[PDB]
Design an enzyme around this catalytic site. Structure first.
Site, mmCIF file in Angstrom:
data_model
loop_
_atom_site.group_PDB
_atom_site.id
_atom_site.type_symbol
_atom_site.label_atom_id
_atom_site.label_comp_id
_atom_site.label_asym_id
_atom_site.label_seq_id
_atom_site.Cartn_x
_atom_site.Cartn_y
_atom_site.Cartn_z
ATOM 1 C CB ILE A 1 -3.826 -87.518 10.437
ATOM 2 C CG1 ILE A 1 -3.895 -86.595 9.204
ATOM 3 C CG2 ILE A 1 -5.064 -87.962 10.961
ATOM 4 C CD1 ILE A 1 -4.342 -87.463 7.995
ATOM 5 C CB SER B 1 -6.460 -92.325 0.872
ATOM 6 O OG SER B 1 -6.639 -91.317 -0.065
ATOM 7 C CB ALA B 2 -11.177 -90.245 -0.874
ATOM 8 C CB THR B 3 -6.216 -91.934 -3.173
ATOM 9 O OG1 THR B 3 -5.701 -91.972 -4.511
ATOM 10 C CG2 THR B 3 -5.758 -93.146 -2.578
ATOM 11 C CE1 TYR C 1 -2.027 -91.736 -0.735
ATOM 12 C CE2 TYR C 1 -0.221 -92.531 0.655
ATOM 13 C CZ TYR C 1 -1.549 -91.918 0.803
ATOM 14 O OH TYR C 1 -2.199 -91.766 1.920
ATOM 15 C CE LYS D 1 -1.966 -94.975 3.079
ATOM 16 N NZ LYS D 1 -1.836 -95.070 4.532
ATOM 17 C CG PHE E 1 -2.111 -77.822 -10.285
ATOM 18 C CD1 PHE E 1 -1.698 -78.429 -9.001
ATOM 19 C CD2 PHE E 1 -0.969 -76.842 -10.473
ATOM 20 C CE1 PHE E 1 -0.766 -78.423 -8.419
ATOM 21 C CE2 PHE E 1 0.101 -76.625 -9.726
ATOM 22 C CZ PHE E 1 0.341 -77.521 -8.748
ATOM 23 N NE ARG F 1 -1.940 -82.498 -8.710
ATOM 24 C CZ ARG F 1 -1.863 -82.257 -7.364
ATOM 25 N NH1 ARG F 1 -1.272 -81.876 -6.563
ATOM 26 N NH2 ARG F 1 -3.400 -82.416 -7.062
HETATM 27 N N1 LIG Z 1 -2.362 -86.091 4.838
HETATM 28 C C1 LIG Z 1 -3.180 -86.540 4.061
HETATM 29 O O1 LIG Z 1 -3.805 -85.922 3.187
HETATM 30 C C2 LIG Z 1 -3.711 -88.198 3.980
HETATM 31 C C3 LIG Z 1 -4.724 -88.538 2.890
HETATM 32 C C4 LIG Z 1 -5.275 -89.773 3.260
HETATM 33 C C5 LIG Z 1 -4.698 -90.813 4.095
HETATM 34 N N2 LIG Z 1 -3.411 -90.414 4.696
HETATM 35 C C6 LIG Z 1 -2.718 -91.373 5.199
HETATM 36 O O2 LIG Z 1 -2.512 -90.966 6.620
HETATM 37 C C7 LIG Z 1 -1.457 -91.464 7.276
HETATM 38 C C8 LIG Z 1 -1.126 -90.224 8.077
HETATM 39 O O3 LIG Z 1 -0.763 -88.820 7.073
HETATM 40 P P1 LIG Z 1 -0.298 -87.711 7.762
HETATM 41 O O4 LIG Z 1 -0.425 -86.553 6.752
HETATM 42 O O5 LIG Z 1 -0.228 -87.492 9.159
HETATM 43 O O6 LIG Z 1 1.370 -87.968 7.249
HETATM 44 P P2 LIG Z 1 2.808 -87.882 7.995
HETATM 45 O O7 LIG Z 1 3.902 -88.059 6.937
HETATM 46 O O8 LIG Z 1 2.752 -86.320 8.717
HETATM 47 O O9 LIG Z 1 2.500 -88.919 9.315
HETATM 48 C C9 LIG Z 1 3.260 -90.132 8.837
HETATM 49 C C10 LIG Z 1 4.202 -90.283 10.232
HETATM 50 O O10 LIG Z 1 4.719 -91.748 9.981
HETATM 51 C C11 LIG Z 1 6.087 -91.602 10.191
HETATM 52 N N3 LIG Z 1 6.734 -92.868 9.502
HETATM 53 C C12 LIG Z 1 6.853 -92.900 8.140
HETATM 54 N N4 LIG Z 1 7.362 -94.063 7.855
HETATM 55 C C13 LIG Z 1 7.727 -94.725 9.123
HETATM 56 C C14 LIG Z 1 8.364 -95.827 9.348
HETATM 57 N N5 LIG Z 1 8.898 -96.963 8.417
HETATM 58 N N6 LIG Z 1 8.199 -96.321 10.561
HETATM 59 C C15 LIG Z 1 7.768 -95.521 11.588
HETATM 60 N N7 LIG Z 1 7.160 -94.285 11.345
HETATM 61 C C16 LIG Z 1 7.079 -93.947 10.080
HETATM 62 C C17 LIG Z 1 6.486 -90.289 9.664
HETATM 63 O O11 LIG Z 1 7.838 -89.995 10.327
HETATM 64 C C18 LIG Z 1 5.431 -89.574 10.036
HETATM 65 O O12 LIG Z 1 5.439 -88.873 11.435
HETATM 66 C C19 LIG Z 1 -0.516 -91.882 6.282
HETATM 67 O O13 LIG Z 1 -0.672 -93.340 6.124
HETATM 68 C C20 LIG Z 1 -1.010 -91.349 5.021
HETATM 69 O O14 LIG Z 1 -0.846 -91.851 4.147
HETATM 70 C C21 LIG Z 1 -3.165 -89.131 4.787
HETATM 71 C C1 LIG Z 2 -4.422 -87.888 -6.920
HETATM 72 C C2 LIG Z 2 -4.097 -88.153 -5.504
HETATM 73 O O1 LIG Z 2 -4.362 -89.148 -4.915
HETATM 74 N N1 LIG Z 2 -3.198 -87.172 -4.982
HETATM 75 C C3 LIG Z 2 -2.976 -86.916 -3.812
HETATM 76 C C4 LIG Z 2 -3.457 -85.407 -3.085
HETATM 77 O O2 LIG Z 2 -4.874 -85.428 -3.630
HETATM 78 P P1 LIG Z 2 -5.512 -84.123 -3.977
HETATM 79 O O3 LIG Z 2 -5.151 -83.942 -5.524
HETATM 80 O O4 LIG Z 2 -7.038 -84.147 -3.841
HETATM 81 O O5 LIG Z 2 -5.046 -83.066 -2.999
HETATM 82 P P2 LIG Z 2 -4.317 -81.611 -3.296
HETATM 83 O O6 LIG Z 2 -4.073 -80.819 -1.904
HETATM 84 O O7 LIG Z 2 -3.028 -81.848 -3.969
HETATM 85 O O8 LIG Z 2 -5.120 -80.687 -4.299
HETATM 86 C C5 LIG Z 2 -6.281 -80.401 -3.759
HETATM 87 C C6 LIG Z 2 -6.808 -79.565 -5.166
HETATM 88 O O9 LIG Z 2 -6.040 -78.301 -5.353
HETATM 89 C C7 LIG Z 2 -5.436 -78.283 -6.582
HETATM 90 N N2 LIG Z 2 -4.118 -77.875 -6.396
HETATM 91 C C8 LIG Z 2 -3.258 -78.194 -5.208
HETATM 92 C C9 LIG Z 2 -2.099 -77.676 -5.020
HETATM 93 C C10 LIG Z 2 -1.539 -76.558 -5.790
HETATM 94 O O10 LIG Z 2 -0.332 -76.076 -5.491
HETATM 95 N N3 LIG Z 2 -2.310 -76.225 -6.713
HETATM 96 C C11 LIG Z 2 -3.693 -76.680 -7.049
HETATM 97 O O11 LIG Z 2 -4.287 -75.964 -7.814
HETATM 98 C C12 LIG Z 2 -5.458 -79.553 -7.125
HETATM 99 O O12 LIG Z 2 -5.478 -79.807 -8.606
HETATM 100 C C13 LIG Z 2 -6.743 -80.107 -6.689
HETATM 101 O O13 LIG Z 2 -8.155 -79.995 -7.392
HETATM 102 O O14 LIG Z 2 -3.116 -85.414 -1.815
HETATM 103 C C14 LIG Z 2 -3.946 -86.612 -1.035
HETATM 104 C C15 LIG Z 2 -3.785 -86.133 0.512
HETATM 105 O O15 LIG Z 2 -3.788 -84.760 0.667
HETATM 106 C C16 LIG Z 2 -3.255 -87.703 -1.267
HETATM 107 O O16 LIG Z 2 -3.979 -88.866 -0.519
HETATM 108 C C17 LIG Z 2 -3.467 -88.131 -2.866
HETATM 109 O O17 LIG Z 2 -2.455 -89.280 -3.071
#
Ligand SMILES: NC(=O)c1ccc[n+]([C@@H]2O[C@H](COP(=O)([O-])OP(=O)(O)OC[C@H]3O[C@@H](n4cnc5c(N)ncnc54)[C@H](O)[C@@H]3O)[C@@H](O)[C@H]2O)c1
Ligand SMILES: CC(=O)N[C@H]1[C@@H](OP(=O)(O)OP(=O)(O)OC[C@H]2O[C@@H](n3ccc(=O)[nH]c3=O)[C@H](O)[C@@H]2O)O[C@H](CO)[C@@H](O)[C@@H]1O
Ligand SMILES: NC(=O)c1ccc[n+]([C@@H]2O[C@H](COP(=O)([O-])OP(=O)(O)OC[C@H]3O[C@@H](n4cnc5c(N)ncnc54)[C@H](O)[C@@H]3O)[C@@H](O)[C@H]2O)c1
Ligand SMILES: CC(=O)N[C@H]1[C@@H](OP(=O)(O)OP(=O)(O)OC[C@H]2O[C@@H](n3ccc(=O)[nH]c3=O)[C@H](O)[C@@H]2O)O[C@H](CO)[C@@H](O)[C@@H]1O
Ligand SMILES: [Cl-]
Ligand SMILES: [Cl-]
Ligand SMILES: [Cl-]
Ligand SMILES: [Cl-]
Ligand SMILES: [Mg+2]
Lengths: 347, 345
Positions: B13, B131-133, B156, B160, B225, B299
């Site tokens: 992101i 996160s929506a989590t 996790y 958040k 899942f 899952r």
């Molecule tokens: N991708 C998702 O689905 C998701 C869901 C909701 C919220 N978030 C949050 O959004 C943010 C970005 O997610 P992302 O998908 O881009 O993940 P990502 O892992 O690709 O990005 C996180 C970056 O932070 C760096 N990092 C980790 N620990 C560090 C530290 N101690 N010091 C400096 N850099 C460090 C990692 O090297 C990485 O490049 C995170 O806080 C994640 O928890 C992501």
């Molecule tokens: C409960 C929870 O907070 N889980 C994490 C998960 O959410 P989350 O569970 O929504 O996202 P996933 O990408 O893992 O799964 C999305 C959907 O796909 C299904 N699925 C996924 C993978 C697979 O191999 N097979 C399958 O069937 C899952 O059951 C779900 O219904 O990723 C988010 C970021 O992307 C994180 O912020 C969340 O911490």
């Protein structure tokens, strides 16, 4: 032969707990940074110097901040601790709401660091100082451990709640950890010797010390924070528990750890609530002096009534608060009278 | 001030957001410790090397860890920041439940150190990756910002929620702070160029990359899942949001900070939920490949459906997601097809 590490051991509850540990045959190693403890004429905090005298046992002490990673690591490398009792931290002095980051840093990051260091040194037995504040504004009474937590008011209470949560997760993930979270109610009183007690610096924020200070003649009158609450007399109600009972509950907690108990949470209270006026009255009785007071505005974030349901602890911990209200008052008075100005270095 | 600090800017992101920042005329300074980012042949992480190439704008970068107080001190002395976008942290590699301390250390202690330095240097404007989590198991759908939060299932997610709470407290305590907490839904897709995108290592935990890996032939079949949830088709439903729109939402957050808004919280979602099977199908259409699947057990800890109420963000931040399902799938496929091994080997 294995030691018990006691963080924040020179403070109010910590000092009393070090005393109980020594008397019970344990070997503590105590750390403190003097944030809220008085330095003695020597290396030991005055409180602990006195505990050494009272018990006739030496106190192993290192001045250190739990935030000092290197010092902490060296400490864990030097000794073989079998458990850690964690009292170190910031407590509200009504301060928290205004300095969130201090509370988050000291309490939260400090405890994360301690847990990491513990894990790394293979020490996975902990006793944590929690508080009834984690319950937030009581939704019902008495407060049992099942009462909802979180939804706390201030940064201080939230810090305690977040720590509990973390430890709960840690135990969940690793069945080898054992942790006892003790939610204290309102600690009061002093060791029966009258030699140690609560030693506030400046104008006390808590009830009891203010009351004793009035009784001793240092303060003119008690400022009662509101008398319009929904309680019998309109004044706040709390479960006051003798510090000595509280300290003994820590020994009970160590024994619980030995059972490989996993994560356990217990309230440490008497189960009886007393109002502000009732405490003043008991202090008049203990002190043999009239204790004036004036009713002022309510204090921000104050709850009407809070008291524990102490059955879980009696059942599981094998512990109960043995000291009553008069004992608490008499013990507090003794400490106060014999030490009109709190701790001081030896003459 | 002028600069915007972007923590974890080399990630999925973050790298897309850095791109958007550059295109909007901002000056970012990125920091990352490579914990989950691939190193290029030079100083820059590959992702950012590419962003630089794509925008034709330079990327100011510093390799460092948020847990390093000394490095934070030097960084804040070297540059004059006007705001910080905080992406750095650990995410579930499904891991959280099993390694609480790592999460709490990096996410909590790291964020607290960052907030301290910010405070120290008078940089009191933050955009946080939430996160929506945090909403936990949905009580109603769609999820609006008013839905209850906390009571999170995992370390996790708990991390958040705890961070949001700390930030709220900070803003309460000091009215000069401005903070925008962005609760992302399910990020997917990739920049239209196909040059950057999510680069998971090992077997992906998230749906989309797993799906794309089956289509490209890296995985035999998708494991679904559960198919017995109370959803139109029995499979889990999620609000998939294009990473480009999400990145753009961060720019809208920056402009919000300028209003001296204090602490504000917004969902970053499309408001449209799609099921696992719908995503599979849409990816078959996008890739022209077949994506075999097998239905397995649910899952642990999975929610049946989760999607956003995007009204507040539209009204207050003035932002809405523009790219739909086909676009997300098209972009995700392009990235995967064009980069079969992610950023490198
Ligand atoms: N991708 C998702 O689905 C998701 C869901 C909701 C919220 N978030 C949050 O959004 C943010 C970005 O997610 P992302 O998908 O881009 O993940 P990502 O892992 O690709 O990005 C996180 C970056 O932070 C760096 N990092 C980790 N620990 C560090 C530290 N101690 N010091 C400096 N850099 C460090 C990692 O090297 C990485 O490049 C995170 O806080 C994640 O928890 C992501
Ligand atoms: C409960 C929870 O907070 N889980 C994490 C998960 O959410 P989350 O569970 O929504 O996202 P996933 O990408 O893992 O799964 C999305 C959907 O796909 C299904 N699925 C996924 C993978 C697979 O191999 N097979 C399958 O069937 C899952 O059951 C779900 O219904 O990723 C988010 C970021 O992307 C994180 O912020 C969340 O911490
Ligand atoms: N007294 C109460 O009413 C009460 C109620 C609830 C829970 N608690 C908790 O129980 C514990 C003990 O409370 P207390 O009344 O004895 O308070 P206290 O202030 O007397 O004891 C805490 C001790 O920790 C030390 N300390 C503070 N920061 C430190 C740091 N960074 N490193 C090392 N030592 C540090 C202080 O110097 C002090 O001696 C605290 O964690 C408190 O939050 C107390
Ligand atoms: C160390 C600690 O955790 N303190 C917290 C604890 O206080 P808590 O209220 O339990 O304890 P205190 O000793 O401060 O107060 C006890 C009672 O005495 C009253 N009183 C106290 C002092 C005084 O000068 N005059 C007076 O009338 C209080 O209003 C209260 O009804 O819970 C409160 C409500 O959640 C918090 O606001 C406090 O931060
Ligand atoms: Cl030893
Ligand atoms: Cl480069
Ligand atoms: Cl600069
Ligand atoms: Cl989108
Ligand atoms: Mg009971």
């Amino acid at each position: 032969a294995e030691k018990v590490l006691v963080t924040g051991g020179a403070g109010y509850i910590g000092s009393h707990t070090v005393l109980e540990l020594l008397e019970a045959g344990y070997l503590p190693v105590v750390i403190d940074n003097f944030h809220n403890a008085f330095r003695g004429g020597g290396s030991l905090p005055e409180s602990l110097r006195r505990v050494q005298e009272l018990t006739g046992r030496s106190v192993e002490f290192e001045e250190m901040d739990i935030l000092d990673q290197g010092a902490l690591q060296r400490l864990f490398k030097k000794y073989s601790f079998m458990a850690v009792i964690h009292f170190a931290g910031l407590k509200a002095m009504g301060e928290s709401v205004q300095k969130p980051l201090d509370y988050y840093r000291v309490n939260l990051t400090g405890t994360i660091q301690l847990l990491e260091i513990m894990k790394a040194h293979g020490v996975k037995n902990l006793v944590f100082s929690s508080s009834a504040t984690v319950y937030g504004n009581p939704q019902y009474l008495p407060l049992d451990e099942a009462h909802p937590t979180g939804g706390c008011t201030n940064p201080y209470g939230k810090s305690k709640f977040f720590i509990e949560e973390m430890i709960r997760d840690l135990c969940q993930a690793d069945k080898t950890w054992n942790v006892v979270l003790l939610r204290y109610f309102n600690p009061t009183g002093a060791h029966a010797s009258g030699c140690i007690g609560e030693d506030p610096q400046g104008i006390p924020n808590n009830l009891m010390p203010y009351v004793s200070q009035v009784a001793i003649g240092r303060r003119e009158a008690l400022n009662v924070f509101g008398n319009d609450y929904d309680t019998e007399d309109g004044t706040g109600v709390r479960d006051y528990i003798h510090v000595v009972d509280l300290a003994k509950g820590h020994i009970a907690a160590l024994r619980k750890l030995k059972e490989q108990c996993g994560c356990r949470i217990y309230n440490l209270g008497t189960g009886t609530g007393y109002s502000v006026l009732q405490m003043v009255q008991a202090m008049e009785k203990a002190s043999g002096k009239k204790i004036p007071y004036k009713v002022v505005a309510r204090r921000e974030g104050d709850v009407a009534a809070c008291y524990a349901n102490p059955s879980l602890a009696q059942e599981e911990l094998g512990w109960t608060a043995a000291l009553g209200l008069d004992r608490m008052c008499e013990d507090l008075w003794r400490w106060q009278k014999q030490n009109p100005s709190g701790f001081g270095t030896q003459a």
